[PDB]
Amino acid sequence: SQIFVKTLTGKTITLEVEPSDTIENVKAKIQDKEGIPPDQQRLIFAGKQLEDGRTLSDYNIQKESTLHLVLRLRG
Numbered sequence: 001s002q003i004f005v006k007t008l009t010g011k012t013i014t015l016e017v018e019p020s021d022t023i024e025n026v027k028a029k030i031q032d033k034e035g036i037p038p039d040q041q042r043l044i045f046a047g048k049q050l051e052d053g054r055t056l057s058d059y060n061i062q063k064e065s066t067l068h069l070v071l072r073l074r075g
Contacts, residue, residue: 001016003066004066005030006066006068006069013069015033019057020057023059024052024053026050036071038052
């Protein structure tokens with residue numbers, strides 16, 4: 001399936017994923033598209049920060065869901 005990642009700058013990124021992908025894996029895919037290190041990515045869905053070690057399946061994220069990317073330089 002695909003999921004979407006809305007950025008602050010405006011662009012929405014489309015990623016090819018599977019339910020077993022970790023949030024880390026999603027951030028790795030964003031880095032391949034956008035050049036943003038996973039370090040600096042905070043992903044949000046339904047108002048909650050997504051943790052790196054959990055899967056898309058753990059968060060019941062299905063195809064065509066939209067995550068929000070927040071850049072966090074550190075604070």
